[PDB]
Design an enzyme around this catalytic site. Structure first.
Site, PDB file in Angstrom:
ATOM      1  N   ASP A 130      -8.873  -4.022   4.904  1.00 20.81           N
ATOM      2  CA  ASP A 130      -8.169  -4.190   3.616  1.00 20.81           C
ATOM      3  C   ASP A 130      -7.660  -5.622   3.497  1.00 20.81           C
ATOM      4  OD1 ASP A 130      -5.636  -2.224   1.772  1.00 20.81           O
ATOM      5  OD2 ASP A 130      -7.338  -3.436   1.083  1.00 20.81           O
ATOM      6  N   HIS A 147      -8.340  -3.381  -1.535  1.00 23.01           N
ATOM      7  CA  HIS A 147      -8.159  -2.179  -2.396  1.00 23.01           C
ATOM      8  C   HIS A 147      -7.574  -2.491  -3.811  1.00 23.01           C
ATOM      9  CE1 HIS A 147      -3.821  -1.530  -1.123  1.00 23.01           C
ATOM     10  NE2 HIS A 147      -3.736  -1.188  -2.420  1.00 23.01           N
ATOM     11  N   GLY A 206       2.354  -1.210  -5.767  1.00 26.58           N
ATOM     12  CA  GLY A 206       2.641  -2.446  -6.485  1.00 26.58           C
ATOM     13  C   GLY A 206       2.957  -3.580  -5.530  1.00 26.58           C
ATOM     14  N   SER A 210       1.245  -3.850  -2.621  1.00 30.29           N
ATOM     15  CA  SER A 210      -0.017  -4.065  -1.881  1.00 30.29           C
ATOM     16  C   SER A 210      -0.526  -5.487  -2.031  1.00 30.29           C
ATOM     17  CB  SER A 210      -1.101  -3.104  -2.349  1.00 30.29           C
ATOM     18  OG  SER A 210      -0.783  -1.755  -2.043  1.00 30.29           O
TER      19      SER A 210
HETATM   20  N1  LIG Z   1       5.101   3.406   2.343  1.00 28.48           N
HETATM   21  C1  LIG Z   1       4.572   2.136   2.145  1.00 28.48           C
HETATM   22  N2  LIG Z   1       4.985   1.060   2.686  1.00 28.48           N
HETATM   23  C2  LIG Z   1       3.435   1.993   1.157  1.00 28.48           C
HETATM   24  C3  LIG Z   1       2.650   0.770   1.204  1.00 28.48           C
HETATM   25  C4  LIG Z   1       1.636   0.548   0.283  1.00 28.48           C
HETATM   26  C5  LIG Z   1       1.359   1.536  -0.719  1.00 28.48           C
HETATM   27  C6  LIG Z   1       0.307   1.337  -1.666  1.00 28.48           C
HETATM   28  C7  LIG Z   1       0.027   2.334  -2.605  1.00 28.48           C
HETATM   29  C8  LIG Z   1      -1.157   2.152  -3.512  1.00 28.48           C
HETATM   30  O1  LIG Z   1      -1.217   2.974  -4.684  1.00 28.48           O
HETATM   31  C9  LIG Z   1      -2.147   3.301  -3.630  1.00 28.48           C
HETATM   32  C10 LIG Z   1      -3.605   3.051  -3.876  1.00 28.48           C
HETATM   33  C11 LIG Z   1      -4.539   3.807  -3.119  1.00 28.48           C
HETATM   34  C12 LIG Z   1      -5.916   3.579  -3.285  1.00 28.48           C
HETATM   35  C13 LIG Z   1      -6.362   2.594  -4.200  1.00 28.48           C
HETATM   36  C14 LIG Z   1      -5.440   1.852  -4.964  1.00 28.48           C
HETATM   37  C15 LIG Z   1      -4.053   2.080  -4.815  1.00 28.48           C
HETATM   38  C16 LIG Z   1       0.806   3.566  -2.659  1.00 28.48           C
HETATM   39  C17 LIG Z   1       1.826   3.773  -1.750  1.00 28.48           C
HETATM   40  C18 LIG Z   1       2.125   2.766  -0.759  1.00 28.48           C
HETATM   41  C19 LIG Z   1       3.167   2.976   0.200  1.00 28.48           C
END
Ligand SMILES: N=C(N)c1ccc2cc([C@@H]3O[C@H]3c3ccccc3)ccc2c1
Length: 246
Positions: free
Chosen positions: A97, A46, A196, A198
């Site tokens: 993913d 992603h 950030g 991810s």
């Molecule tokens: N609660 C978590 N651990 C968590 C873990 C990973 C995450 C990752 C994102 C990414 O910003 C989301 C996104 C979705 C779809 C495409 C690109 C980015 C947002 C919240 C997130 C929250």
């Protein structure tokens, strides 16, 4: 990373910092990654699916700060950007993913292991740690969900693994979380991964060995009650990792 502690790359030497170059020359942080072999960084599809041009990416190893050229760091371009062919995104959940980045320096070389650059062991098939085990996560992701900037210094935290049966509860993620996914969180919902973080590692000490058990994938908000971090279950993807790194 919400909460946790600031750290340095010598404590997380498998951590890869991935950036993207925009038209005009500006460089911005994208996602985290993990070094699984000198030529190969594993991350999340992603992070790249909307900009699938390998030439756009910059990967750093041995880097402790977002805007500092850390002593001993190594900079690379992406020779091969491999995205999982059956990747898909639902309202919350991301499927398959997982991504591989074959890295190369301008001299055509892979990573040189050192005190601040090291690989992380992959798990063996059907061998994940038991629910309740403490694992660590690392990244440059948001410190608060309302922040738009990322922290300058690398952060880490410790979270506990949550069973598939608990994560499929109605107030958790129901049937949106699959057996190819792993949940982990703080029992007090104070610390977690966030946007950030991810593509970054979920490292578990398993039978005495530090192992790449997961890859930061998705979650509902950050450090929200009954909303764990969801991670790509690395052990399921060992045939796909072995076949695509050959
Ligand atoms: N609660 C978590 N651990 C968590 C873990 C990973 C995450 C990752 C994102 C990414 O910003 C989301 C996104 C979705 C779809 C495409 C690109 C980015 C947002 C919240 C997130 C929250």
């Amino acid at each position: 990373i919400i909460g946790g502690e600031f750290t340095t790359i010598e404590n997380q030497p498998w951590f890869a910092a991935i950036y993207r170059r925009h038209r005009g020359g500006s460089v911005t942080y994208v996602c985290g990654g993990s070094l699984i072999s000198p030529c190969w960084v594993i991350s999340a599809t992603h992070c790249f699916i909307d900009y699938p041009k390998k030439e756009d990416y910059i990967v750093y190893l041995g880097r402790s700060r977002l805007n500092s050229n850390t002593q001993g760091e190594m900079k690379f371009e992406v020779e091969n950007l491999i995205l999982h062919k059956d990747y898909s995104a639902d309202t919350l959940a991301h499927h398959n993913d997982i991504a591989l980045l074959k890295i190369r320096s301008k001299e055509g070389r892979c990573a040189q292991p050192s005190r601040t650059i090291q690989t992380i062991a992959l798990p063996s098939m059907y061998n994940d740690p038991q629910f309740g085990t403490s694992c660590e996560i690392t990244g440059f992701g948001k410190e608060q969900s309302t922040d738009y900037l990322y922290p300058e210094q690398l952060k880490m935290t410790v979270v506990k693994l949550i069973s598939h049966r608990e994560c499929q509860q109605p107030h958790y993620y129901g049937s949106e979380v699959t057996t190819k996914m792993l949940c982990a969180a703080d029992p007090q919902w104070k610390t977690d991964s966030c946007q950030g973080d991810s593509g970054g590692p979920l490292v578990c000490s398993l039978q005495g060995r530090m192992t790449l058990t997961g890859i930061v994938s998705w979650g509902r908000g950050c450090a929200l009650k009954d909303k764990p971090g969801v991670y790509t279950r690395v052990s399921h993807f060992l045939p796909w990792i072995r076949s695509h790194t050959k």
